[PDB]
Amino acid sequence: PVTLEPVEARYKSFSIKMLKDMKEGVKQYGPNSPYMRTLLDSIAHGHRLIPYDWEILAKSSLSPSQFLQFKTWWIDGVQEQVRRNRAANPPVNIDADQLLGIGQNWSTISQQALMQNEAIEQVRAICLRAWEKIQDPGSACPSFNTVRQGSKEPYPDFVARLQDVAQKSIADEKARKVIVELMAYENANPECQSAIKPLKGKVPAGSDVISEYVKACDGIGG
Amino acid sequence: PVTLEPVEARYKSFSIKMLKDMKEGVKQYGPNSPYMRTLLDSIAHGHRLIPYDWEILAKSSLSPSQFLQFKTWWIDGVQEQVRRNRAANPPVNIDADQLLGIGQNWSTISQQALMQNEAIEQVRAICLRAWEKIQDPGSACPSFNTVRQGSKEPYPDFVARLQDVAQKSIADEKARKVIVELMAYENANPECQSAIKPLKGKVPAGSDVISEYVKACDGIGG
Amino acid sequence: PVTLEPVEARYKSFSIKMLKDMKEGVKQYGPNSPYMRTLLDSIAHGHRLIPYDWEILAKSSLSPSQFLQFKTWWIDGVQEQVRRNRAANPPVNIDADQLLGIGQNWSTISQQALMQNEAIEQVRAICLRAWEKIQDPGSACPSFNTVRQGSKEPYPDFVARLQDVAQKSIADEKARKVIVELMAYENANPECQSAIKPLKGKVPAGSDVISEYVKACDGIGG
Amino acid sequence: PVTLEPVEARYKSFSIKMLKDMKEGVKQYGPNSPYMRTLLDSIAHGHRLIPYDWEILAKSSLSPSQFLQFKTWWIDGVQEQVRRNRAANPPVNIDADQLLGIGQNWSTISQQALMQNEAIEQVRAICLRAWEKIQDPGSACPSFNTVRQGSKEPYPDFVARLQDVAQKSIADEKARKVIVELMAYENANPECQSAIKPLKGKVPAGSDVISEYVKACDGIGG
C-alpha cells in the first residue's frame, strides 16, 4: 500500500502477520471462498494498492499454478480496458503499461507511487475480477450442461455449484441471474422437479425465486 | 371487427375468404409459423377486435385441442392483468368479465361494441400471447435440458428449436436473449464446440452473437 | 452492531478477529454445535444487531448452500410473525419489510439504526431460530422412523441424534420433550429394550427420564 | 418497395397475395429453385427495395433456420464490400450501417427511403448472393469429393448436383465453369467413363461441353 503525508508518498511492505492470514485462507478455505472475498475487499478498499503490491500479495498467497492464471486474466482484462478508453470521448490517457506496471515509465516503486486515484480504481476492478476466475487446484471450469443434480444429493448444494460456474463464465450480473433460475429447474432431479412446478413463475412477496425452490424440496434427499 | 361511422358501431362477420386463409395456414404451416404471426398481426392491428371476434377466429381456425389451450391461457392471463390494474395508482376499472366477455354486462355484441380503445389494446396483448403458447398437434413443450444438438444435424436447425422453447416458456424478451446464447454453446455437439470457443464473447461489429456461431460451423454436418 | 451515545447511533463493522472465530467454528464444529450456540448467543444478547448485520455475519461464516437455507427460513418466519402481529389487540405496526430490511424505508444503515428495541428483540428470535434449522453440509433432515439404534452402537449417541431431529422439526419445546422419551424406548435395540423396561415410568427423585435410561445400558455396546 | 412522385418517397407494404406466393414457393420448390430465382429477380429489378424490405420478405418467406443463414451472409458480404469501397480511388462513402440498416442514421423507414440509387444496387447484389447460399432444410453443403455418380443413377441428375455445389462454394462464374467440366468425367461411373472418353476436349460447333456428355450416356442407367 501507499501511505501519504500532510504531499509525499511512502511505500511500506505488508505485515508478516497479514501475509500469514492470506496464506492460511487460500490454502484451507479457497481463494474464492466468501471469507476471502470479504478479507481481500477489506484490504483493497481500505488501502491504496499499486500494481507492484498486487504481485507481492498474490505470489505469496497463491500456488504457482494459480499465479499463472491470475497474471493471465490481468493481462486479458487490460486489453479490453484500453479498447474502452480510446473509444471514449474525451479519450483517457491510460495505456497498457501503466495498468500492468511494466516498461521503464512505470516499473519502479517511486514511479508507480505518483499514480492518480482514477487509475487506482481502474486496476482494482481488473485485479478483483482476475481473482474471481482462479480455479480450485485440481479443477477445471465445467460447462452448464454437466452441472446436473445427482441422486441422493441435497438441493442447495446443487444450486450453489450453478452460481459458481456462472460467476467465472459470465461477466454481467444481470445476465447471471437469468441463467441460474432456469437451469435450477431443468437440471434438477425428478423428485425436485415434482415439487417446483406448482411454484414456477410465482413468488408471493419480499422473497427471491431461489429461496422458494429450496423450501419446496426441503426434505428430499439421500 | 367493429366498424364505425362519422358515432355508432356496426358489427360485420369475417369474410368467407379470410376465414379460409387462416384455416389453410394453421393446418399446413402451423399456428406459430412466422407466416401466421405476420398474418394474424395484420388483422389485429388493422381492425378492431372485440372478445367475441377472437372466439370466432380461433374456433374456426384451430383444432379442438388447440382451442382448449387458447382459452386456458386467455383465462390465466386475465388473472395477472387485474392484479396489475388494482395495484396501480389510480386504479383502472377494467375487471375480469370485460376482458373475457362473460357475465351479463359484456355478453352480447351490442354490449361489447361500445368498449374503449384502452381495453381493446389490453385484450389484444393477452390473446396474442395466448396464441404464442399453442403447441403443435402431437407435441408437448420440452425442457432446456433435452434440447441437445444430435450427431449429423445442422447447427441452425438446433438453435431454432432453442428459440422456440424460450418463446413459450419465458415471458420476458430480454431474459430470452440471455438463455439462448449460453445454451447454444453448452448443448451443442463436440464438433461445433470445437469451432465456437475461439469466438466466444467476441463479436467484431454490427452483428449478433448468433450469426457468428452459425458462420463458424458452416460445413459441419452429416 | 449499533453503538450509542449519552442519542445518536454509530454503526461500526465487526472485528477482523471476531469474524475469524465464527468461520473457524462453523467450519470445524458445525453451525449448531453447542459451542457455537453459546458463542452466537453471546453476540446477539451482548450487542444490538440490525438486519444488515445478520447478513454480514452469516454470509461470511457460512457456506453458500447454508446461506440459502438461512435466508429461506428468515423469510418463512417473518410471514408467520405478521400473522400474529395483525391478529393482536392492539395491532402492532411491525410489517415485513422492517424485519427483513428491504424496500426503501428500511434498506440503509442510517434507516435501520433508528429501530425500536421491541423490533430488535423480534428479529433476534427469528434469526436465531433460522440458524437452528441449517443442516450439516452433505446432509438432509431425517424422519423419526429412520432414527433407529443400530447394533454395536452406544446408547447416548443414539438419543443425541433424536434430540437433533426434534430440534429442527418441532418448534415447541414442551412437545419436543414428549416425543424423545417415547422414541428412546421404541427405536432402541433389543439389548437396551431388555434393560429399560423395569424402569419405564418410574424416576426416583431429582433426575430426568433420560439419565436413568443411559445408566441402565451403561456397558452394552460393540 | 419505395414508390415515388413527380420528389417525395412513399413506403407501402407488400401485398397479402405477393407474400403468399413467395411462402408457397420456398416451402414447396425450394428457395433456390429456378422458379424462385426468376420470381425473386422479378421483384428486385422491378421495384426499389430498401434494407427494411429485405427483412420483411425474408422473415415471412423463410424458415427460422434459413433466416439465420441469410442474415449471416448478408453481414459477411458487407464486410468485404467496404474493404473494396475504401481501397478505391476516389473513396466511396458507403459504410456498413447504411447497407445493413442499423444505427440511428439508417434505422427507420423515413431515413432509408432517401437512399441513392448507387447504394440500392449495392445491397441488391449482396442480398441476392446471400440467398444463393441458403441450404435445403435438413441439409449441409457437401464437398466436391463426395459428389460421385452412383450406380443405377441417371447422368444429368449427377451433373446437376455438381452445379449446385459449385454455386454455393465458388463465387466466380468463370471459375465455376472450369471445375464442373473436369469433375463431370472424373467423378462419374465407369459406364459413362466408357462413353465420354472418345469425345473429351472436342466439341463440333455451337454447343457446350456438357450437352455432348449427356447425349453420349443417354441410355445408360438402372
Numbering used by the authors:
A (entry chain A), B (entry chain A), C (entry chain A), D (entry chain A): 1 to 6, 21 to 236
Original authors' sentences:
The majority species comprises 12 HML2 CArec pentamers with all interfaces equivalent, obeying perfect T = 1 icosahedral symmetry. The structure is resolved at the highest resolution (2.7 Å), likely corresponding to the 32S species observed in sedimentation experiments. The NTDs of each pentamer are associated proximal to the five-fold axis and form a layer of structure at a radius of 86.3 Å (NTD centroid distance) from the particle centre. Beneath the NTDs, the CTDs form an “inner cage” layer at a radius of 64.7 Å (CTD centroid distance), and more distal to the five-fold axis. The NTD layer does not contribute to inter-pentamer interactions and so the entire inter-pentamer interface is mediated through inner cage CTD–CTD interactions across icosahedral two-fold axes. In HML2, the vertical displacement between the NTD and CTD, as judged by the centre of mass (CoM) of the two layers, is 21.6 Å. In the pentamer, residue R143 located at the C terminus of α6 in the NTD makes a hydrogen bond to the main-chain carbonyl of K182, located at the C terminus of α7 in the CTD. This configuration facilitates formation of a specific hydrogen bonding arrangement between CTD residues D171 on α7 and K229 on α10 with S79′ and D90′ on α4 of the neighbouring monomer NTD (′ denoting a neighbouring monomer) and defines the pentamer conformation. By comparison, at the unique type of CTD–CTD interface in the T = 1 particle the α8 centroid displacement is maintained at 12 Å, but the crossing angle is significantly enlarged to 65°. This has the effect of twisting the interface relative to the solution state to meet the constraint imposed by icosahedral particle geometry, although remarkably, the hydrophobic interactions of A189, V192 and I193 are preserved, and although much of the polar network is lost, a new compensatory S157–E200–N159 interaction contact is present.
